[PDB]
C-alpha cells in the first residue's frame, strides 16, 4: 500500500478539524485549566500550520520530518503559554514558537561539531555583513574588509570563519572515481614504524647494560629513583627510607652515578652520541 513515512503522517493530520476563533477561546480556557482533551484537540487541529512552516524552513537544514517534529515541540510550548483572554489569534502566536524552535534546533543539530548559539549567531552577523559588502564591492569580501566594516579585530573575524569550515567525509572517494577514499591515504602519524619501536627496545636495553656497569649502590639508587627497574619513581625520602636514612645521601649517590656514566660516555660514548639525531 502506501509506505512513505511522510505521506502517512500528513494523511493523519489531515483528518482533524480546523478551529474558529471562538472555539479556540473556549477550548483554550479549559486547556489552561488542564483539560487534557482540549490541549490534544488544539494541537492536532493546528498540526497543519506546523507543516506549512516547516515546509519553509526546510530546504537544506534537515529532513522534512525532523523539522516537523521540532516544529511540533514549538507548537506544544505555544499551547501551554497561550493566552485566550488576549484578542490575538492563536495561529499568530504559534507561528513565533514554531519558527523559534525549528531555528534553534537547526543551529544545534545541523553541525557535526556542536556550535554554541552565541558563536553561531555572531558568525551569522558576519555573514549578513559580508553579503552587503559583496553587493557593493562586486566581489566577495576579505576577512579584513569585513572586520573594517564591523570596526572589530581581524583575528575575531578569522577565528569565526575558521569555525564555519565545514567537514569532509573520510569515506568520500577521490577524484570523481569510485577508486579510493581519503582513508586509503591517511596514515596513523602517532603509530611510528617497526623502526621506532625497535629503537626503543635498543635504547632501553642499552640503558640496562650501562646501569650494571656502575656500582651496585649507584645502580640501585638510580633504578629506584628514576622508576626504571622499580615500579614507582620513588622520591628521595622513599629511597633513603628503604636503604640509608640520609635522604641527602640518595642525592649524593645519584649524582655520583650520573658522573660515572658520563665517564663511560667520554670513553665509549662514541655509540651514545649517535643517539642524538
Amino acid at each position: 500500500r502506501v509506505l512513505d513515512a511522510t505521506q502517512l503522517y500528513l494523511g493523519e493530520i489531515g483528518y482533524s478539524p480546523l478551529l474558529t476563533a471562538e472555539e479556540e477561546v473556549y477550548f483554550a480556557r479549559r486547556a489552561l485549566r488542564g483539560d487534557v482533551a482540549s490541549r490534544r484537540r488544539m494541537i492536532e487541529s493546528n498540526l497543519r500550520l506546523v507543516v506549512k512552516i516547516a515546509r519553509r524552513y526546510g530546504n537544506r537544514g534537515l529532513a522534512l520530518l525532523d523539522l516537523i517534529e521540532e516544529g511540533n515541540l514549538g507548537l506544544i510550548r505555544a499551547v501551554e503559554k497561550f493566552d485566550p483572554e488576549r484578542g490575538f489569534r492563536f495561529s499568530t502566536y504559534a507561528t513565533w514558537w514554531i519558527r523559534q524552535t525549528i531555528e534553534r534546533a537547526i543551529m544545534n543539530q545541523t553541525r557535526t561539531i556542536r556550535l554554541p548559539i552565541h558563536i553561531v549567531k555572531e558568525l551569522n552577523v558576519y555573514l549578513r555583513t559580508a553579503r552587503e559588502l559583496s553587493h557593493k564591492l562586486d566581489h566577495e569580501p576579505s576577512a579584513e574588509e569585513i572586520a573594517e566594516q564591523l570596526d572589530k579585530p581581524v583575528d575575531d573575524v578569522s577565528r569565526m570563519l575558521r569555525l564555519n569550515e565545514r567537514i569532509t567525509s573520510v569515506d568520500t572517494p577521490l577524484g570523481g572515481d569510485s577508486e579510493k577514499a581519503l582513508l586509503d591515504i591517511l596514515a596513523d602519524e602517532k603509530e611510528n614504524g617497526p623502526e621506532d619501536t625497535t629503537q626503543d627496545d635498543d635504547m632501553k636495553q642499552s640503558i640496562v647494560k650501562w646501569l650494571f656497569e656502575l656500582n651496585a649502590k649507584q645502580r640501585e639508587v638510580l633504578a629506584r629513583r628514576f622508576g626504571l627497574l622499580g615500579y614507582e619513581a620513588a622520591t628521595l625520602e622513599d629511597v633513603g627510607r628503604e636503604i640509608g636514612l640520609t635522604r641527602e645521601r640518595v642525592r649524593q649517590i645519584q649524582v655520583e652515578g650520573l658522573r660515572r656514566l658520563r665517564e663511560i660516555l667520554q670513553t665509549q660514548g662514541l655509540n651514545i652520541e649517535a643517539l642524538f639525531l
Binding site: 628514576f226 626504571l228 650520573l258 658520563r262
Partner: protein, 50 residues
Amino acid sequence: TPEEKLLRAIFGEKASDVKDSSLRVPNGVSGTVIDVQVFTRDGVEKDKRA
C-alpha cells in the same frame, strides 16, 4: 619515558618549544630554484624576503 628522564638529567639537553615542519626537497628529485612567490594575509608582519 623514565629512561629519557634519566638521560636528559645526565646530559642536561632539555628539549626546546618549537618543532620542525620545514618544506624540503622530495627525495631523489634535484634541480634549480628558479622562482619564489610569497603570500601573506593582510595584517601579518611581512618577511624580509617578501
